[PDB]
Amino acid sequence: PLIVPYNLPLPGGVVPRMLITILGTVKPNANRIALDFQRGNDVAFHFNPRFNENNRRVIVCNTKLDNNWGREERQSVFPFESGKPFKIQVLVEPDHFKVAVNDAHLLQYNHRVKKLNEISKLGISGDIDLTSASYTMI
């Protein structure tokens, strides 16, 4: 187990068939979680479960370029629960990030940042206890 926030190094960036697994438990009174795949100061892929946005649960995904957030992609499907252990898996494909939570497909996010081999850090933050963060090649 690790104390958030935590940065997982992705040396030489990401590549298709790279599978990132994040294990943790959502805190009992959680408001938000974020994964940030970073290319320097840019955020290639921000994955942001929000537990109370206007009293609704939503997944917000976005990219940050030159310190500006772009067009949000939102999902109503919300697989997380306060207090409960989770597994987030991010599969890097040639054209998108694929996300599954607790072994169920959640969403895919088209690559806006094209230089996958420069996406060299994964930031993990928010209202979780972080158990582990690792990757393998499938």
Ligand SMILES: O=C([C@@H]1O[C@H](CO)[C@H](O)[C@H](n2cc(-c3cc(F)c(F)c(F)c3)nn2)[C@H]1O)N(CCO)C1CC1
């Ligand atoms: O609220 C936002 C921003 O939306 C952006 C995506 O469009 C980011 O989510 C921004 N964000 C979240 C976090 C964050 C999240 C966590 F879970 C953390 F634990 C943590 F430490 C930080 N850091 N930046 C967010 O301020 N907006 C209003 C409409 O959605 C958009 C900008 C117009």
